[PDB]
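To close the section, here is one more complete example, presented without commentary so you can practise reading it yourself. The ligand is sodium ion.
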Amino acid sequence: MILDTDYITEDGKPVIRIFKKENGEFKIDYDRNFEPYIYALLKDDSAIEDVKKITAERHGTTVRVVRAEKVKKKFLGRPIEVWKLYFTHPQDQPAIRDKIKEHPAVVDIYEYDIPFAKRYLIDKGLIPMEGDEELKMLAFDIETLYHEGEKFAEGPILMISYADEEGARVITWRNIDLPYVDVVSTEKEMIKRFLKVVKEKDPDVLITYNGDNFAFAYLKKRSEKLGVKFILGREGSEPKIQRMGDRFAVEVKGRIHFDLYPVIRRTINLPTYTLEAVYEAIFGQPKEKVYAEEIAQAWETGEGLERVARYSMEDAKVTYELGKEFFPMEAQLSRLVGQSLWDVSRSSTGNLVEWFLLRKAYERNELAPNKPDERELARRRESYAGGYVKEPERGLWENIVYLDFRSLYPSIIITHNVSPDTLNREGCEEYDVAPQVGHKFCKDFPGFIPSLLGDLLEERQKVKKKMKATIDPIEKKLLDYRQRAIKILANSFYGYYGYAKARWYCKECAESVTAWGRQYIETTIREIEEKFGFKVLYADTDGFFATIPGADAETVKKKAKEFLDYINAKLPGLLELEYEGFYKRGFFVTKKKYAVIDEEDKITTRGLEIVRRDWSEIAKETQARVLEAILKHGDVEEAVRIVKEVTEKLSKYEVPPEKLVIYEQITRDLKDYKATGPHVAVAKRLAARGIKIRPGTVISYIVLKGSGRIGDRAIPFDEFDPAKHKYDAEYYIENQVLPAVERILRAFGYRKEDLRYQKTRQVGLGAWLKPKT
Ligand code: NA
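Output:
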């Protein structure tokens, strides 16, 4: 299977390199005969004799148009006649692009900034990550000590941990006695040992969590200060830092650097993205997290060293296991899009759509529109819209169905043939009209994009059919990824239409699709209320919740399903409502804020759970028990009672100290946070122990009863002693606990004031001590 492609240049001539894993053997194929090209639209064919003779200068060398041929292609829904201009080198294109574009007979140029190594996969019909071939993978992570008044990576790396099929290990130059740890002399010998272990395992895949921004950069800058030759690429390469938006990305030649961070960020949503918050979500097993203070404590002192080595080991093992989860999925997308997994895993959804369109465009002989220049980009970016919402019926309700459209936006696009190439066309005989915005989309001929979508939705269905028919759970699992990759791509098309960097950009398309979305949601709701006597409790563009008042669980289920058959016979084309679930109880606060409980006693929440950086167990626990009281027990008053009890217990210092640890991933150095707040005080307590915390790591502190502002006395949690230390109850009540339950309970009629007992050490600072939203 094809892992990746690039090119090298040999005496000014480009050579495509194709990295392959076949029958357990890595190799590199070469293609010396792949020619770069662009297209040009001319006013009169006679002008090509001028174009053929245009030259520019690259480093003293005259760059020329090597060859031209006329080709018929489709563009903008209609035939176009263009000129294919061949070159020697892909880098000749920009230099000569500017000149050719100033020729009065040249209307414009096309497909001139499509990377050569990618052009190659498209044109040759090649697809990465195909076939059976198994791949050896290996995760790694590093532990570092931080210096505040310094440059990047001045502090040494103390630990390099890795994880394989064979297990996990830690390399270090501190004195530690554990089975899985190998000890060495220096940091230099540690790094060298890591390079030696990688080079000999020969992984096809290097897995990291955030290695694009931390691990690799750190490893290079340290090798640089220490004089170590940082070779990890198969063909003798130091890994190359690459310009990836605002931040960076690292490539390793011959291997695939699978950085887990962008994948997880683009997969499942969360507040703080700790390696530990992620292993929680997708596995259900607790972290065993040791915080940043405990480990920098082990660096100077040496106490708690074996616990750090366990932690470091666990970073690796988790990183590996997380990698075994996300890889096949990302291998499917890279297979579906036609681009390397390295690219595909770091791409935005809009950009994944672009690469998919480009390749299909090649197969259909469709000329691709250019990107926007600086002026168009700003003009596109300066667009906002609103959204649909049916504001909720307040309160607690029972026997709730949840109904959603099957692929709302893809359906609209296919059914109404919504495409830049079908927009307000001239002399059109069949057109649908967009609601609100009034655009006319032609149906005389299928749009380029609509038809590709059509085929995607149909392929998904076929794959799903085969998944459910397949008894073999290996093939079953694989088909399931296949199916789910189609979903991710299909559902990206709507975004892409309004995606400012998009080649087939079409704001008119975007807003039309949004408007038809509203209409279908709107008329379906009107119909469920009038024809079927339901009460719609809440509605999004992700679907709606409804019940029949005074009907039991199975009347509602039967009627909803009867309603589906009724509207699905009345909805146009591919538009189709589905049964998404049932919930015995639920309540709805506002747009995308709600909690519901299904028949398995499982609470699903939306826009409600704690998304602050500085969180604690006492807040989470108390919120959980409120939602539990309302939804499990059907008791709103118990919920209010519980909060009153919890706040009382806090007042009287009966809440166990451990539940009051505030975990916060720090956004910069602690020594320079907002003057007021617990941060400065934690920084002094840590400095006195000779510790500094790296921005981007999670600290642990408890807030104590103090002599200044409430919240300004806070200590490291390991420093806590039940005598000589009292915690600041008012801080846990007004900053932590109340804010976690105020929104939920306001929806039921309760004010902040109703959530404490009449006299329980009230300090009237709620408005100040609350987090500024
Ligand atoms: Na689905």
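Once you have examined the tokens, check your reading against these statements. The longest strand covers residues 577-590. The chain has 23 helices and 28 strands.
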